[PDB]
Amino acid sequence: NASPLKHFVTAKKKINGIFEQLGAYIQESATFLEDTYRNAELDPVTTEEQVLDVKGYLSKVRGISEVLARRHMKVAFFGRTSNGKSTVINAMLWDKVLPSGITTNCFLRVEGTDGHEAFLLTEKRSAKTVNQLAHALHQDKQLHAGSLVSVMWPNSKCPLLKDDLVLMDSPGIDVTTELDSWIDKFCLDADVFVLVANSESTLMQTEKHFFHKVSERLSRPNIFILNNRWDASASEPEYMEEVRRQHMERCTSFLVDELGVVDRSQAGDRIFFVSAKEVLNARIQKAQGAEGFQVRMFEFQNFERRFEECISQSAVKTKFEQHTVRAKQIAEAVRLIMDSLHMAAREQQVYCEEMREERQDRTRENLEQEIAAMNKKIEVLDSLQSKAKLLRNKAGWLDSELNMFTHQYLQPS
């Protein structure tokens, strides 16, 4: 079975698809309206506000097309540098992607590219090897913790990237580090937050404050707790069993009671005990070619899965909700303009028919000349009712199509 990120990858494809259909619908509607308004052999059935309103809708819809086709999922990692925040990301990308061991104090952003080698962004600085990446960051005195650097990584290497996932590494938390600017400047668009901690120590207060600010400011943030450095339990399995259950009770109370972001039932799908160092080494080994190993190796793969389910579900609902509602209300406006035009063309066709009845009450010279002109005009109006009624009904299709999307991908879960 396939990665849960396909849920996001597909829904973006559909919502991108609907907006292409909607753009073509307005383009055609704008064409039909403006040419109807321009024909000066009919009493006005449309006004120039309607034509311009629709031309505005055409521009707006093309504007939303650009932003939608760029939507992506975002996961941010926080914590102390020593707890392995950086190896965790490396483990999920199956590579040493971020400088680790002994790291720079700024925000890092990992996104994929179709090109087959790597570069930096703050221009297009090269970074072929991880030692190269550490130095480009080392030389540049100008960067700082509030700056944002993007690692643009080949997505043929990592399927996470191909599926429109962005990974963001935050600077290592310390006791007086000012996290206060962090959420508004960088994490407002983030779908899941990962606290990478250490199993046997209690969370820093500064860690806790940052994740409470996220709880207050954001709309149901999805918070995972990663307890790293857990390979110590290879040699003291009996003790670490006692310690796991104690820390599991700590993190749950933090998540369920202190923060309120998950009730007790889901808490186990949000708190994990793993060793990213082990997972990293193993996956390095696998591409090229201790005790309790498989159990810890399986927990990381399970956490990876539980995270990809969460991010894909939540990201779709958050990046597309407003754009679906906008499309539905644009389709409604264009549908009423055609509806107004269909009824005005009808009301004028009635007028012309009486004037044809009246003409046949008058003189005989040029009767059929004169009744041809009126019969020509009546046919245009009748044909206008046709195309307008068609344009009305397909706006309902768009309405039916977008409502299907809300039902499938925007239900409150």
Numbering used by the authors: 25 to 126, 129 to 148, 153 to 319, 328 to 400, 706 to 756
What are the paper's exact sentences on this?
Outer mitochondrial membrane (OMM) fusion is catalyzed by the dynamin-like GTPase called mitofusin (MFN). We generated a modified human MFN2 construct with deletions of residues 1–21 and 401–705 (MFN2IM). MFN2IM contains a G domain and a helical domain 1 (HD1). In this study, we address these issues by presenting crystal structures of truncated human MFN2 in different stages of the GTP turnover cycle. These structures explain how MFN2 uses a primate-only single amino acid variance and a tighter G interface, as compared with human MFN1, to allow for enduring GTPase (G) domain association even after GTP hydrolysis, a feature that is unique in the dynamin superfamily and ensures efficient membrane tethering.
We determined crystal structures of MFN2IM in the nucleotide-free and GDP-bound forms at 2.8 and 2.0 Å, respectively. Unlike MFN1, MFN2IM has a disordered switch I in the nucleotide-free state, and the Trp260 does not occupy the nucleotide-binding pocket. MFN2IM showed much higher affinity to GTPγS and GDP compared with MFN1IM, and could efficiently bind to GMPPNP. The stronger nucleotide association of MFN2IM may be partly explained by the aforementioned conformational variance to MFN1IM: the disordered switch I and outwardly oriented Trp260 leave an empty pocket that facilitates nucleotide docking. The cluster is apparently disfavored by the Thr129 exchange in MFN2, which endows the observed flexibility to switch I in the nucleotide-free state. Intriguingly, we observed calcium ions (Ca2+) associated with the HD1 of both nucleotide-free wild-type MFN2IM and MFN2IM(T111D), and one of them is involved in intermolecular contact. HD1 is connected to the G domain via the so-called hinge 2, namely Arg95 at the C-terminal end of α2H, and Lys357 between α5G and α3H. The four-helical-bundle HD1 is stabilized by a massive hydrophobic network. ɑ4H, which comprises large portion of the conventional HR2, is substantially involved in this network. The C-terminal tip of ɑ4H physically contacts the G domain. In our crystal structures, however, Met376 is surrounded by Phe56, Leu57, and Leu734 from the neighboring helices, and separated from Leu727.
